[PDB]
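Preliminary data (for renewal application), sodium ion complex.
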Amino acid sequence: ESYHKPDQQKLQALKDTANRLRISSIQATTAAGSGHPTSCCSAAEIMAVLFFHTMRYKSQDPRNPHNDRFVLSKGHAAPILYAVWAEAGFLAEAELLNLRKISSDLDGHPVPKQAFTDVATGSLGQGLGAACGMAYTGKYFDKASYRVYCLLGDGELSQGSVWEAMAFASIYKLDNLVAILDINRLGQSDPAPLQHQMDIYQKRCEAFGWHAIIVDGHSVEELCKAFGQAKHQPTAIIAKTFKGRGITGVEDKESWHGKPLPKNMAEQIIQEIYSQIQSKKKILATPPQEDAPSVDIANIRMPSLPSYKVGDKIATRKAYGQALAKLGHASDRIIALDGDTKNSTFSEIFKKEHPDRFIECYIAEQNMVSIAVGCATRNRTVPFCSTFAAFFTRAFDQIRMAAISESNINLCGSHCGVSIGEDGPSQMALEDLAMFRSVPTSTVFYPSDGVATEKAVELAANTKGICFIRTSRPENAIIYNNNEDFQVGQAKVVLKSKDDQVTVIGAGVTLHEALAAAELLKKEKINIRVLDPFTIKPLDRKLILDSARATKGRILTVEDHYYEGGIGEAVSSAVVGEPGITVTHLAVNRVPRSGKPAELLKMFGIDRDAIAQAVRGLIT
Amino acid sequence: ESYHKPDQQKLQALKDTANRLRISSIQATTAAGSGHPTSCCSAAEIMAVLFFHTMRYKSQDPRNPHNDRFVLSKGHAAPILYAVWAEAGFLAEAELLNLRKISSDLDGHPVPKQAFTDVATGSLGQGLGAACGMAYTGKYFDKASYRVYCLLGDGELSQGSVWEAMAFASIYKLDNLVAILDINRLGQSDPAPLQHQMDIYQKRCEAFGWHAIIVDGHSVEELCKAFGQAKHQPTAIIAKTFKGRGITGVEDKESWHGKPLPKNMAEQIIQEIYSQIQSKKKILATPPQEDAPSVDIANIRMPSLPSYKVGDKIATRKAYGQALAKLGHASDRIIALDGDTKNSTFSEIFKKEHPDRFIECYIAEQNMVSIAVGCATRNRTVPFCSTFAAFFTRAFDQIRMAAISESNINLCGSHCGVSIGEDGPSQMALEDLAMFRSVPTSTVFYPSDGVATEKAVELAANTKGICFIRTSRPENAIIYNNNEDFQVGQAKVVLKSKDDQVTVIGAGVTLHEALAAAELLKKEKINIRVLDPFTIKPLDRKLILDSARATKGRILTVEDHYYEGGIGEAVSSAVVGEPGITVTHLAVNRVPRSGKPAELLKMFGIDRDAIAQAVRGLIT
Ligand SMILES: Cc1ncc(C[n+]2c([C@](O)(CO)[C@@H](O)[C@H](O)[C@H](O)COP(=O)(O)O)sc(CCOP(=O)(O)OP(=O)(O)O)c2C)c(N)n1
Ligand SMILES: Cc1ncc(C[n+]2c([C@](O)(CO)[C@@H](O)[C@H](O)[C@H](O)COP(=O)(O)O)sc(CCOP(=O)(O)OP(=O)(O)O)c2C)c(N)n1
Ligand SMILES: [Ca+2]
Ligand SMILES: [Ca+2]
Ligand code: NA
Ligand code: NA
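Predicted structure:
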């Protein structure tokens, strides 16, 4: 469709719109007593032109799948986002004045309780990665005409995650993606490093494969023109702006970031801005081409039961890849992402079978998580991203923000614990249960054999929120029948007798060590009950307690994880105060070191012999 | 000092050295049965030239403060690092064959139990940030002649953290820093994105402010020459290499990352490499100029007691800045780092008083943590880095690796919990206690007033490991006398009576809410004991239990944090099984939202009224 070259009246209306957006940003933040009007004002022309000339969207249906996407990466400019959606007719204008109130959903930074927000922002440097996922989805999955626009701050460009996204977009030729850089010179507490050295921003963008255009970010005409030309590459509109533009005496000054105008000043400034507005008549949004496809919403089911055999040996990391590939044959919604570890996590199996739905994210875990979040928006795909669980610590802020974004993503982290052996602690996940348990929307699966792994993959696919699956390197025996029923929050008793003296809770390699301990102890005429949690969060408190009551109240937890935040603490917190119940923990007490898997389980006190000794100690 | 232009014999000796390093890397990884010989072999000439022509260091004293630093950012090339230190005469050559054994310290990736390792690597993309801290320290603090060399992989350059470090080095004019990029074309599971497009690497480095030189990374002469010219900017030596260089049939091939050669193949290949070596005679290291200054090692003491007054109001975030500035007058070892939040964390106070020892790190928390780790190496400084606690989640992998690095850094995270109010959840730290408690070397301080904050700063300065101080936004009353003695692991009972019915444990704003609850309850003739942990890790289990035993066994924890991994779980895990002890928790159950601080404490069930109701419930 042809560019509509605006006449002077349309240009003036865009200026009038920009100034209305300034006024609202000031009014709202002065009413609240907090917020970031100067960060809004540098972006006012950008916002006016995007929403009232360039973008195509249904103003009354912001989540519509055919719409262009807008991502406010500099989320503290929320008041101007709210203002455009009022200008577009979706929000009531009076509601803007309720910014930041407990009685409003116009919160301090954008959040998905707002129909016009897909991802929460507020932690800087994450929006472009989400936008890349949206754009990748648009070009390669939806195969639709929508475009994706992401507005970033200049201080924000100091985040490495932004540059991961830049690189991703050029690798994947996201010519439906536009990044708008609000180069307003200043950060929060000092000038941004490059200030108004526009040429250096251009060189950095070009070196990362983008088409880069420097503009006057306060010229509505230059913005219309620059946004009106599609390219064959991701495009960076590098906008020279002034922080607090239009606020006389504040424009281009330090000491104003995140400071509202006092009421007396707001009144005077608003009168001046209003004097520049030529007409009250608002521009209307223009609707999109409706070419996004339908997506099915039904539950996704494995095409058959697991086909393992009891006694066969397989590492849960390999079972994950097998199960994910299997699930991919059941539904085209499943996509897989991995950060140059596909041969070790076994997501390569999925790539072999379903290459068009695998996204290689390279060694950039922060961006990988953001891509997944973007791909999941508007329920367009069901993503499974994988790496070593240790390296999900590199993406914790993205995971944290994903929960604030109410995102439905699945994350599988392999190589947990000391049982990986020789690579040593840099590769050992020993804090991932702590990390993922702290994510409020999380479900944490810790499958102990191949059957449980396949069931965890299936359950995760159909579970909302942040699903984490912890996989392991050692080959361990299949212990479950492949028709064993598995559910979130339901544990399994895998060994019992009427004369059990301790309930031992293990998972993954420590479940198998507990079973080996039981065999050692039978020689001493000591029986133990062995319990496999299946999910660490939520925890089957009832079965744990019922088990403990059959074993003299005694629970022993054993885990290939640090003491804090893991299985032992979860269990302790669940049962504390219950009469006659005791909980004893075995876990890894310090940074480990290289050795064979069995040697490290021994050294760190979580193998069969440590378990047996702890049991004997409890009995006496 | 003049470049010594090598003769053909010295060049041949450097080639011979490179080939010896290949042989050792193969031998060691074949002996271990695991490791990354192909990743070693691409770097062999680089390593030979750095260690035996360019660098200046004491071969028998790798930690010597006058030495040039080398950082192996691509840590999986550990076997070649070990091999150079054997070649230099520090390690016994026989020991190289014990790679990855539980009986050896030649672990899978480098770790600081090795004298020649300052920081652990293995999580890719972190070494350059550490190197930047070392170089900044060398140029601006030590004011010494040592240089810093950091070897990176090409896949590794996909990490955003690398680009943060690139930008930092040019901002701070680190002309004593050299990054060597091993552009061997291949990552772990596919070619690296840019493969051998050397010009694009050059453009990216130049756009980020570095002097960039493309070389044949297998030419010892080109390497000598390129390393021999100092510059006025940080310098990137962009080395075109082949993965598995020198291994016939493996060089430049996929499917070989992290795969050792089988013994039959290793023998054949080693014979071929050995046939290329002209002389067995080894080159000797050359020693450094000894111009690094002495650094004092004594305990650092505040110059006077805190000067607060009981009843005065101050936010602990502001007390942190005051206390840090105060401590800076006591010792020149203290340095402060912050990520464009100095006005909000109050580290700006330190910057005002001690500007030469403040490092602005901009909006790049991952790199900030790495800079701090680098600055702490060899005990050259005592760093305190600050941001909002929420944004330390962006740096969790750096923090995790800092503990593996046995680093002594101090981290202060502000803006904890819902009590910040209107900014909303993106800015609210609700998982930081979980995160930092899971770090094995951590001490977690949660000061509840200005006095406790100043004491926490002082204690942290003198405590090894990863020290975290959690600060808060609300002004709360000073409750402690300024001569109150504080110690790690020692809690305080701040309200008691003989007829106390519940021990209520709070911290920060919830300690003050608990005190307000006690006042509400006295009206009902209910007294509660109130306990302030001071440190969450380690936890004063004895005082908690002694308190509980005076209050009918009943403990109530209340925290401005999520349920998992926080104060409630720490307490529960400490006391579980103790006869007659019960623990009830109040915490934040889901992602919050914007409102006034008091409104959010109410909504999320952690204010004075929630506490009072929970207490009444326990009594009945
Ligand atoms: C990952 C990360 N790191 C730092 C920040 C902090 N930050 C931000 C906030 O947290 C807001 O999201 C703070 O402003 C915050 O609201 C106030 O400090 C609270 O003040 P107080 O009254 O509580 O004292 S914004 C910011 C500077 C961004 O500079 P830019 O140049 O990117 O954007 P702009 O010039 O505004 O267009 C910076 C640096 C962030 N949001 N995300
Ligand atoms: C933050 C981060 N992300 C991914 C990695 C993984 N990674 C690594 C390791 O974890 C080693 O540190 C793995 O190799 C690991 O040892 C094996 O996967 C274990 O195999 P398995 O036998 O257990 O199956 S190395 C690596 C590729 C690095 O490619 P580069 O091009 O940077 O270096 P190079 O070509 O080797 O000079 C990549 C991608 C990392 N170390 N750090
Ligand atoms: Ca800015
Ligand atoms: Ca490589
Ligand atoms: Na899911
Ligand atoms: Na310390």
